Structure formats: C-alpha cells, structure tokens
Design a protein around this ligand. Structure first.
Ligand SMILES: Cc1ncc(C[n+]2csc(CCOP(=O)(O)OP(=O)(O)O)c2C)c(N)n1
Ligand SMILES: Cc1ncc(C[n+]2csc(CCOP(=O)(O)OP(=O)(O)O)c2C)c(N)n1
Ligand SMILES: Cc1ncc(C[n+]2csc(CCOP(=O)(O)OP(=O)(O)O)c2C)c(N)n1
Ligand SMILES: [Mg+2]
Ligand SMILES: [Mg+2]
Ligand SMILES: [Mg+2]
Lengths: 553, 553, 553
C-alpha cells in the first residue's frame, strides 16, 4: 500500500524475522495491518512484558534480534523491564512502538509521552522517527546495534501519522553487522605465555563465553590445555560430560562456593566474555595479587577489584582458537594437584542432600536431581528468579549451549514461562522446560493462555513454598525477621486446568520422578506443582566452606 | 534503629499514610525491616504494576498520595506504566524505590540503572538521594509535589547504603501543600458577564471537576444558573438525579455524541478542571467561533482548537463558588430550548437497545442497565479499558463523586481489579465493583490472590467476547480487516476458583440480574463471567447522529 | 511567503517582541529571512552566550520573555549557560534554535544533536517541533510557560525542513499567561495575627519581591507596619531613602552581616518571593525557633532549615496589599529597640573604610561610594561576579526597582556588559553602567563591538587587580595557598580603543570621582580601568561581627 507501515514490515522481511510478538492498538495499527499482507507471524501476547520476554528468548537462542511490537503510551511503557532485562543480559531485541501524531506530540493527549527519552537509559539505542523516509534507516541500524557486541536492546518509536503516511521511499539492504577479527597477535602470545608460566591457571567463563561458537572453542582449549574452569550462571552449558573433572561449578550471589576458593588460589585467571554483572569481581578477586587476562568482544570495566593485566579484545571464538592452537598442556605441581582435589571433594559434598535431612517435602537438591534426570541434555530449560533459582543456578548441570537460561543481569521475576514459549517457537518439535517459584509464577502466568493457544510443548515446574523466600532468608540473616514475604497459595493444578492446560501435582516426595516423566510425555502445556522444603536455604549464604578450607590451608 | 530507613518510615507516619503497596527485595530491604517496627500496614502485591495501580486508586479516592515501595532494577522498572498512568490522570502517587550502593552506581552490577533518569519523563518529580541527611527533605517535597495541582506522580530512589546508614538526622515537619485562593475577582466578573449574555452557555466538566469538593461546587452552579452540562469520563459522578434534565452525557473517544452537538451549538463554554487528554478540543471545539472560559488550578495549554478568551486560574471549588454567588439563572429563547429539547430526545434514543435486536447473549446496554440497577449509589465501580469501557463510560450513570473510576489519560489495560482492591482498603466494609473485558482481565488478574488474602468484597464483571474488540472494530472501520485481536477463552469460573475466590457465570441473558445480585451478596472476591454480543460495537464510532442532527439544523 | 518560518515570526509579532538577539546559520536561515519582511529588529551578537545574557536582561527588565535565535549544533549548545542562568534567576527567556532536517535527525551529520534533551535539565520547557502545523502552539506555550511563576527559560528547536515548509497553517492568538489571585483570606489573616503578636517581626525581601510591582507593594507594607527588612541581592531596589532606618542591608554569601543577626533575633520572618538559591536558609534560619511565613507565587521547598508555619501562595503584590490593608503599625518594646539600634551601628561601621587604611590604590568602598555619587537613581547598573560583586552587592545602595542587576542564582561570569547592552535597548536614551572584575570582563568583552555598533551609552567599570580574587581569598581561608587565580594584565584603555570605544584610566585614587564622571559624560561605549587594593577582601568572610554581637548579647 506504500505506507510507512509497509517499510517497517519490509525491514522485518529483509531481516529474516519469523515471529513478531505483540499487542495491537490504535497508534500502531497500520503496522499490524501491513502484517496481514506479508511478513513474520504475529504472536499475540497477553501482556507486553511477556512479549518482551519472548523476544528476549528468541534473541538469546538465535543470535538474531527478537522482535516486539506495541502501541503507544502504556503499550510502550509496559516494555520497560523486558527491554532493560535484555539490555543487561546480552540478548539482542528490537522493540517497535507507536506514538501520537507528530502534530500533537507535545500535547496532553491520549497515550502520549516521550517514548525515546523513557528508553534512553535502558537500551543501547532509543530513537523516534520523525520523517517516513527515515524508517528503513532507523530500523536497519536498530537491528545492527542490537546485535553488535555486546548485544542488547534497541527501541524505535513511530508517530501514528508517520506509519500511515503514503511514500515512494525505498527499503535499504539488511546489511548484517560484521564480526570483529581475533585479538591482536602480540596479546594472544602474551596470554599463552601467562598461562604456561602459571602455577595454577584457571578459566572463568562468563556471559559471552556461553554462546554456542564460544563454548565449542572454549571446550577445545580446556581439553588441550587441561585448565580447571568455572561458569557464571549465563555460561551454563559450557561444561561437557568430558570436562566434569576440570569443572569447579557455578560462581555467583554469595562468595562461598568451591569456584570462589579455586579462583582465590589461582595466580592467573583467564576470563571469557565476562560481564561482571553476573558476579561482581569484588567478591572473587580478593585475598590478593593474581593475573587477570580479560578476553571479550568489548573492553573491560575497570574496578577496584578488576584491573586486567592483559586485554584480548576481538571476536571471542576466533581469539580462543588462536590461544588453543599454540598453547600446550599445563602440568600441575603436587601442591596445586592437592588443592584441586580437595576443592573437587568439597564440591561433591556441596551437591548432596544433608545426612540429617528428613521432611514431608522434597529437598531442593532432590528436585534438581530428579529434574535433571527426567530431561534430555538437548532440551532447553528456562529458570525464573528466587531461592529455587539459586539451587538451579548452582546444581542443575547443563551440557549443551543455551539449554539452561537464567536472568542473571536484572534477576527479573516472571521470565521463565514466557522464555519457554519463545524457546518452543525457536525449537519446533522439542519439549521446553520452565522452572519458577510460586511468587515469580504469577508475574507472567497469564501467558499460559498463549502457550495453550499455540499448543506449545512446555512443562512448567513450580517450586511451591508460599513465600518470597529469596528475600526472606536474606532478611533473617540481616534483621532476624521477615517483612512482606507471605502470600496465600492458589490451586496450581486448577489454575492450569482453567486455561485448558494440563495440571499435575507431586503429592508426596517419592512421586517426583514419575510425575516429572508424566509431564515430559503429556500433550500440550503442563504445569507441575512441586511442594518444597526451604528450611535448608539459609545455608546457601553460609560461610562454612570458606572457613573450613581456610583452616585446612 | 536510626537508619535512613527509619527516616523514610517517619515521613510516612507524618504524612498519615496507612497503607504501603509493595514488593520487597535486597536493595530496599531496610525500609521493609523498619516498617516492622512502625508505620503504615504493608500490602504485598503480586506485581509492582498492580502495586502502582493500587496506590493510584488510593490517591484518586483520598486526595493523599498513594504509596508504593519497590526494590532496585526490575522492581523499579515495573513501576513505569503505573506511574505514567497516575501522572497523566491527575492522581497523587509517591513511589519509593531501592538502588545499588552509591560506590557501585556506575557499574554493570545486579539490578543497577539510572532510576531517576528512567522516571524523569513520566513523573512530576524524579530524584535519587545521595546523602542520608537529605532523606526527609526529598520525601516531604515528593509528597507536596505529588499533591499540588495538577496532581501526579513523584519518584524517589534510595541507594542501599543510604537507607542502611546510621544517622542522627532529624525528621522535618510534614508541611502540607497549601491550597490556592480563587481566581482573580475581575476575571470572575468578566466570566459571569459573558455567561449572562450568552444565547447558550454550557458547562464542560472535566478531570479536576471530578473531585468531591469540585463536584459539590459545580452542582450548586448548575442548579442556580440552570446550565446544560457535559462530563468527561473522569468527571463521572458530577450528575445527580435532579440534574438529569440539564445533562447531555459523557463526551470522549469519537465525535458522535449529543454532548458534542451541544458543545457545537454553544456560543459560550465554561470548562472546569479540563485536562484535554480526556478528549482533545480539536474534536468538539469546531464549526464556529465560540467563547471559551477556562477554569482550572493550572494555566491552559494553547491549542489550534483551544484559545481561551478568559482564564480563571486558582483553587477550583472556591472559584466556582464566586461565580455561583453572583451569577443568576439563564433564560433560554425558544430557538435554543428546541435545540436542547431535540438533543435530549436524541440522547434518550442512543441509550436504548435497538428494536430489531435479538441475540443468545446480552446486549452491552442490558449489562450496563442491569449492573446499575443492582448497585447502590454509594458503591465504587472501577472500569478497565476496551469496548466494554466505552459502553460503561457513555451509559453507566454515576451519582456520587469517585464511584465510577475510568483510566482516561493513558487508557491502561488491567487497572480495574487492582483499583477495586485499593478502593476496598479505602472503604472497608463496602462492596467494590470492577468491570473489564476478557483481554484486560489477564493483564492484572494475578492480583486476585491479594484480594482473596485480604478477604476483599470485590465483585469483578468480565465481558466475554474472546477478542481485543476495541482495536478490532476500529481496524475494520479503517482497513476492513482485523489484525492480532484473537486469543483463546479461559474458564473464568474455574480461574476464580483456583484462587479460592467465587466464580459465577451468566449462562443465559435472562439470568443477568440474578447472577449480579448473587455476586453482590457473596462473601470474599467474586468473578462473574458475562457473555456479550458485540455486533453493535461498530456503531460506537458511527457518524449517523451528527449527520441526522445536521439535516435537522 | 507562508513557510513555518513565517509562523515563527507571526508569533513574535503577536507577543509584542521588539528585539531578537541572535546569530544566523544555515539551519535557522528561513526564520532570519522571514524577519527581513516583518517582526522585531535583529540584534546580531558576537557570541550566542551573550545573545542569551542580553535576552535574559530583557526578560528581567520587562517581564516579557527576552528572545534569542540561533542555529543548530554549536549555535544551540552555546546557549546552555545563558539559559541555565536565566532559568535559575527568575528571568523569562524564549530560545529558538535550528536543527537538522527531520529525515537526518538520527544521523552523524553536521550540527545535529538531541537539542531538546540537552536543554531539558536547564529549562522549564524544552521541545522540538516535528510538524509545521504545531509551530504556533509550541511557541505560544513557550512564551506562557517562560512567563508563568516562577519565570524561567523555555527552549524550542526547529528542524530546518519544518521552518522551510510551505503551509496553510493558521497562527494562534497570543493568549497572555493570566495573573493568579492573592493567597487565600484565611492564610492572610493568620499571617497578620502572627505578625502583630511578634516581639520582633522582620521582612526578608527575595528574588520575586524585586519586581517593580512587588517592591511597590512591599514599600507600603514596610512603611505602614514599620517592619525592619533585608534584601537578597536580586531584591536590590526595594530600598527608598525613607526606609533606610528600617533597612538592615543585603544578606548573602557569608553569614556575617547585620541582616543575619537581625534574622536570628527575629521571632517571626515574612519571606517575600524568596528563592533560597540566593542564600540557603541553613545560613540564616539557625540558633532558635522562629516563625516562617512563606509568601510566594509558588509553593516553598521544604528544607531542614526551612519549614514554613504558613504558606501564602498566590500573586505576590495582591497578597502583600491584603496584608498591608489590615495590618497596623508594630510597636517595639525597649529590648528590641536596643537590638535594632545596636545592629544599625554595626551596620554603619561596616560601611566605612578602616581608619588605618593607606594605599596607592582605591579601597573597594571608595569605588562603591564614588560610583553611587556619580550615578543618578534611575540609571541601571549591572554587575558581574567576583570580589568586586561582593562589595557592590553589599554596599551599593539602589533606590529604584531594576537598577542594580546581579547574577545571584548561577553567579555567572561575564554577564555585566551584555546585560548593560540589553538594558540600553530596553531604555533607549539612558546611560547604563556595567561593573566587573578583570577576570569576568574577558568572558564577554567581545560584545563591546555590539555596543559600539549600536552606539549604546554604556559605561563599563573594570575593577583591576590581576586575579580571580573571589576564588583566591577563599582558597587562602581553606588551604592557605592559591591555585590558578593568576593571569597577565591587558591594556584596558587600548582594548577599548581597538573596538572604537573610549577607554579611561584612574591613574591615582584621587581622580576616581572625575574619571567616572568623565565616563558618564562621554559619547558611545566607555571602559574605565580602575586599579583596586584587595588586601581587605578576606574580611568579607570574617566572623568578627557575629562574635562581637554574641558577646554583647
Ligand atoms: C520484578 C522483581 N521484583 C522483586 C524482585 C526481588 N526478589 C528477588 S527473589 C523474590 C521472590 C521470589 O519468590 P519465588 O518466585 O516464590 O521463588 P522462591 O524464592 O520462593 O523459590 C523477589 C521478590 C525481583 N527479583 N524482581
Ligand atoms: C497496556 C495496553 N496495551 C494495549 C492497549 C490498546 N487496547 C485498547 S482496548 C484493547 C483491547 C481490550 O480488549 P478487552 O479487554 O477484551 O475488552 P473488550 O474491548 O473486548 O470489551 C487494547 C489492546 C492499551 N490501551 N493498553
Ligand atoms: C563561568 C564561571 N566560571 C568560574 C566561576 C568561579 N568564580 C567565581 S568569582 C571568580 C573570580 C572572577 O574574577 P574577577 O572577575 O576578576 O573578579 P574579582 O574577584 O577579581 O573582583 C570566579 C572565577 C564562575 N562564578 N563562573
Ligand atoms: Mg516461593
Ligand atoms: Mg474482549
Ligand atoms: Mg580580577
């Protein structure tokens, strides 16, 4: 029809977008109309927050920007947290939003605000198009900027008259953002030299080390050089079953893990795609004096506790390959071998249900174990935020890239189920597993209607305790009292059923394996109610292990 | 304990705040701890969005800022829409949010962002406190600005170390924002003179004419001077059964109502507390030279279609009282009486179900009528956004200030149920009615747990059609096709039941009266499923009436 | 012609603007072109900064916004300090700036930036017009907001294509911002009662008390009730020769003046149009409980040291008149008479050159005295920032509204000379005196070419010491050493002459009176070089007086 709206759809077509997540409204209507003629499939969301989470999941899983499309005013403002989350967790997302006509842009008029100014602090790129001619340029740059390292959120606002205006404007080529080359040669050489001369060189795999191509490169380096390593939460899946012996767990949240003690003992740390948001360096880079090699697609943030002696800036997998090719196996002296062994044993003890445990409900580690054992390595598992997520982030092994998805920048409640829906669209023919607490579940559970409507093969595990627990035990640790953490319980089975989904319940802890398998074999979306005992949770913040290990040394 | 957190709580105590809506988190924990010792009762929300909506309703109902308290990062960013909606709909709200420690404010660290920069474009006042001493000043000023005409949102962010820091800083007195005097005497005199000389002076009652004290003054003026009048949606409740003959209904959305024709025929229009966001002056102030008198607490926005001949700026009720005191009854000539008379007849016809109507579902006007007949004058009714809300906004009579609440600034989906919860807390012991479509219902339906937890006597009416209808019929008018408006239906009765609420269904249109009454007579929260036939909705945007009236003229 | 540019000019004509200060450039050309056909006279500045200062002076002097017109990029950005200064000193200014065409607004292209975002934090109103039809609305609203209390800066940006676009858009009426009524009667009565019952009530005249209409009202109040009073620097001109006995000087900068001690001894303080930027309440409102009555056009800022017991909010002059009408003469008991008398003696001693003074250069007080004696009451005197301005702000009497202009919000160097040029344009045919130090002189001395071109009868007094002295003596008090306060001297006489102006020099202190008079009797701009001895400056910050009065008490 030659409107600005058609230019928007044309960009989405050129970009290879297959799904647009959105909710329509008057100001953005023409784009939704143009999408009836051609373009990506519209996935109708039940809340713009969830459309944004779904777009985030697509960006994380495909490396190409998830797309969310909304109307003016509350349509756009409902995107705030979603875009903020994607923008701090390395996920490319392009948001497209309506606004009032240019002529009324300054007025007190229905659903008008400064769209661009609102998204400026929470996006890589936030613009409003004020001439129909500029649409293909603004949108194309939005895609490129969202994808370029470090990937993030891009926001483009369209005044209603701009998307409705008839124009003879041409589209532009979807010029793909090009990758950087590997880090400079002298820097690669210096890193190899730092690793070979080290008493105990260790690898810290972070956010951008968790991409598939980076994991593949990391694995070769780890196997050849036989470096011990650790994961941040978003680096989950770096581990392969072959590397279990060199693996020292997931660091984060509280400094009391074997990975912390390993990092303390290292004299050289090679960090890969490390965004410190996942775990501030003031937590691990302590004790004193150790070499930091910072390997990433962008330069490091300088911190009191993070002053890289060496920066290898460039494309991450290429850089890792250069190191791998010329580095040789590292030989450990006996002192360090013993250290590695002890930490490995402490690690194994940390993963066990306590000897003095008895309960009418499952221990978190029982839920983790049974879940891991009922789900194939290749199945994508998404996780929400809370005490369950501490357990999952630490103890749920993952062995394939992008099969354990966690919000570890913004720690945003409600992401798990919509992430799973985004995942299922990206992985047709595959089950997707989502895990949340009961608090976070209701943040986005209305999107279960979307899952049912799509007949998505999603299995949602709700850890049921009836509190905002992650807040609660930290409150007890600081103040010895809780505040605003209690709510009533709902019937999760019947909630599921009211949406036309399947609802299951682990009625007693011994039924865990059977019910989980039943979910994996059920038709359509499943919600599983899993009662959990959280009395052991305060130990997630316990300082026993760093003290024990300190006495040993 | 004497922390910054105690200073925050002391301010709430001095402000006379009885309820704080919020969700705790690590960064804002100390304030929630301090609220255990004293201060307002904490209402735990199931989403910060709903906490903000609840605070908005308290603000609208009480004239004192509703208070919402949230943690850093996604805690704060989830407030965006809530605060924006309050900021543009005249509702005083104070938001208090946590942030990361000052030393790390610039870092990539968990849940960190420029809180103040984010809320700057969508609030009257958006600040971050960087010294514990400044807390009582920042908070007190936030309350005053939130309350001062025109009322809106204020946002205050606290870095974690600021609220945890021990200090001997003194509280400040809660100096209440003072009301203004009436508009200048000469402006009042001139306004009276222009009204007395008019062939057809009419009153347009707007957003700030909808406050109890303003409605009280407005009614005396209307009664004595015998002016025809019209309401904006947020002026609902201005009407008394005694003023029905002077009442030409609610204007808004589409220019096709008797109220539009009244305004066109007027030679003098007195607007009262008129925020043009409810209905742009370009829609009604057309086809002819006409005198505009702007009575408000703030100066007017100048528009092509709104250039006031006179501005009466000052305290609204006292200004109206000065006019009422010296104005006298207006005498209509026979020509103008017939105009008024004909418009009243057109109005009556518009409120009727068409004669050739037959359906297996309720007509929207049957739902409006039966609902109104089942609800006592004093009961607060909240409304959501959509086609249902158009029928309610036009045809649901209200006879008391603050008994029909509509989002007529941002038009935000999901407000109705959380608004009903806020209302129930402001008016303990009273039923509160909430009305939504099936689309908007799921935007906020998770807050049903809160309602059940409080044993709130809320009765929620769901208009069931299975689409985003308001978008849909407008798409058909423009494009002769819809886009992205379809979703599946959920079982509303079973949805309600899973929360421990009561679910009812109008299974056939003849049971509407009984089922409504059954809801009004139940204990605890009720959700009512009401099937509706929307085939007449397209006529809501029809130009038939202005055309018919044009020929008559 | 009927482009957007013509709509801009039509707005200036309707506003009654007689002078536009500006510098042309490609992006804003059309407006400058349109100004050749009709509208205000263009005054070409030699720097946009100075164009802003000149507009600020016009706003302060006329109460109608000074108007500045600049191009895109560095044209607009050169306005920052000027607008920031106007915006915090109560001066109405409207800035009109160009920008890049809409299509290229997001590009790296010559002179493009987000204009509106830049000016957002430093203006009352900062907007960009994106549709030619919106021009008349945006501009008219800019004038009203700049003028509305509290007056400040409004900024409007025009993309080049918007102002070059041919349009049938109509102008809008220049609807003048309406006056508020006085404060409410009950607040007035209460203030009168508190004043009558006071042992020692005093008036603090502030920024918005310095307007001609307010001073006029203030004078009646002070005369009838016989209240002692003090001025802030921007309240200069409140004094008349008849009120000298009730006059306790100008407060500000350092707490060591009779006015501070007066305020301390007072039990009731009526502040008038008080913006605390001129002197923070934490300096004067100390050592004891006292009643604060806040009289202003806007609500007060609540501070630890400022919690008004009463707020009288409304039109300032009317509110004062209402007080004056019903208040009666205050009777002082002997204790208070002695306090007042003691303070007048201290005040009189403070205005004298020390007896032990001997120097080969003038004492600051000799310059002040001689200048005052060489300048008629009506002549506007503008002042810069520095040690010279402390002497002037304290000791230069003014007897007429708007005849001593000081930057007491931002304290901006360089204002004096451009302010004098603005003044000379507001008051054609009158001499204007400008006073600066040698440091601030060069901040804006290039505008001397503008003064010479206009043949403006300006006499500029340069206090010559060869340092940034106000910084220097303050550095010595804190650190006992200076840093970066020294620069070389220029030949001020030759500087003046190179511009085609007259340069004079006070070669010895005894020629002070005659050289100044020689400047006042000269034709065209004159710069006067006056050597000054700053060895007594450190006493401006001396704590001597408050200690002596403390011992006396
Ligand atoms: C949007 C948002 N609000 C608040 C928080 C702070 N917060 C962290 S964990 C938590 C509660 C988690 O509760 P739940 O989902 O039931 O999981 P559980 O800890 O009980 O296993 C909250 C409110 C957050 N991370 N995100
Ligand atoms: C947060 C938000 N998203 C989108 C819109 C645009 N919008 C206006 S009405 C409507 C659909 C309402 O559907 P429903 O609640 O089922 O009521 P119905 O129209 O069917 O009566 C939408 C999506 C909006 N006003 N607010
Ligand atoms: C734009 C700007 N830069 C710096 C300052 C800081 N400052 C305040 S007073 C002063 C000294 C100015 O020296 P001068 O004009 O010669 O006056 P003097 O003190 O020597 O009389 C300075 C630099 C300022 N007020 N404004
Ligand atoms: Mg829980
Ligand atoms: Mg619907
Ligand atoms: Mg100097």
């Amino acid at each position: 029809k030659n409107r600005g709206a058609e230019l928007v759809v044309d960009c989405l077509v050129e970009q290879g977008v297959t799904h647009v997540f959105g909710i329509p409204g008057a100001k953005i209507d023409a784009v939704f109309d143009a999408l009836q003629d051609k373009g990506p499939e519209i996935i109708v969301a039940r809340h713009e927050q969830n459309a944004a989470f779904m777009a985030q999941a697509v960006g994380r899983l495909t490396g190409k920007p998830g797309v969310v499309l909304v109307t003016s005013g509350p349509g756009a403002s409902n995107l705030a947290t979603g875009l903020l989350t994607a923008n701090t967790e390395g996920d490319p997302v392009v948001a497209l939003a309506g606004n009032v006509i240019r002529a009324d842009r300054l007025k007190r008029t229905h659903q008008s605000l400064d769209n661009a100014a609102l998204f400026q602090p929470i996006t890589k790129y936030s613009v409003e198009v004020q001439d129909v001619k500029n649409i293909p340029e603004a949108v194309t740059n939005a895609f490129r900027i969202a994808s370029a390292g470090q990937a993030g959120a891009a926001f483009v606002s369209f005044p209603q008259d701009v998307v409705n205006e008839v124009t003879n404007t041409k589209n532009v080529r979807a010029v793909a953002a090009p990758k950087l080359g590997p880090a400079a040669d002298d820097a690669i050489s210096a890193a190899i030299a730092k690793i070979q001369t080290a008493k105990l060189p260790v690898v810290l795999v972070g956010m951008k080390g968790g991409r598939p191509e980076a994991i593949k490169a990391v694995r070769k380096l780890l196997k050849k050089v036989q470096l011990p390593f650790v994961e941040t939460y978003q680096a989950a899946g770096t581990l392969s079953r072959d590397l279990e012996d060199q693996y020292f767990g997931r660091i984060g949240l509280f400094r009391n893990q074997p990975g912390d003690l390993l990092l303390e003992q290292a004299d050289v740390v090679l960090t890969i795609g490390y965004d410190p948001i996942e775990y501030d360096p003031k937590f691990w880079n302590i004790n004193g004096d150790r070499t930091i090699i910072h390997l990433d697609e962008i330069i490091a943030d300088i911190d009191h506790a993070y002053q890289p002696d060496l920066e290898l800036i460039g494309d991450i997998p290429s850089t890792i390959n250069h190191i791998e090719h010329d580095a040789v196996k590292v030989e450990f002296a006996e002192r360090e071998q013993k250290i590695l062994s002890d930490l490995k044993q402490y690690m194994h003890e940390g993963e066990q249900v306590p000897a003095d445990w008895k309960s009418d409900r499952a221990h978190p580690l029982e839920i983790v174990k049974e879940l891991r054992n009922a789900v194939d390595d290749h199945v994508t598992v998404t996780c929400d935020i809370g005490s369950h997520a501490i357990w999952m982030s630490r103890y749920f092994r993952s062995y394939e890239p992008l099969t354990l998805m966690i919000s570890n920048g913004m720690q945003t409640l409600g992401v798990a189920l919509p992430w799973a829906i985004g995942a299922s669209l990206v992985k047709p023919g595959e089950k997707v597993v989502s895990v949340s607490g009961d608090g976070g579940f209701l943040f986005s559970a209305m999107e279960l209607e979307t899952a049912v409507r799509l007949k998505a093969p999603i299995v949602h595990i709700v850890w049921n305790d009836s509190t905002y627990d992650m807040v609660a035990f930290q409150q007890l640790k600081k103040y010895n009292r809780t505040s605003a953490v209690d709510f009533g319980n709902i019937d999760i089975v019947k909630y599921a059923e009211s949406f036309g989904a399947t609802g299951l319940r682990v009625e007693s802890p011994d039924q865990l394996a059977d019910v989980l398998r039943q979910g994996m074999n059920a038709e359509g979306p499943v919600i599983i109610d899993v009662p959990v005992d959280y009395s052991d949770n305060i130990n997630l913040a316990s300082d026993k292990l760093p003290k024990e290990f300190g006495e040993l040394m």
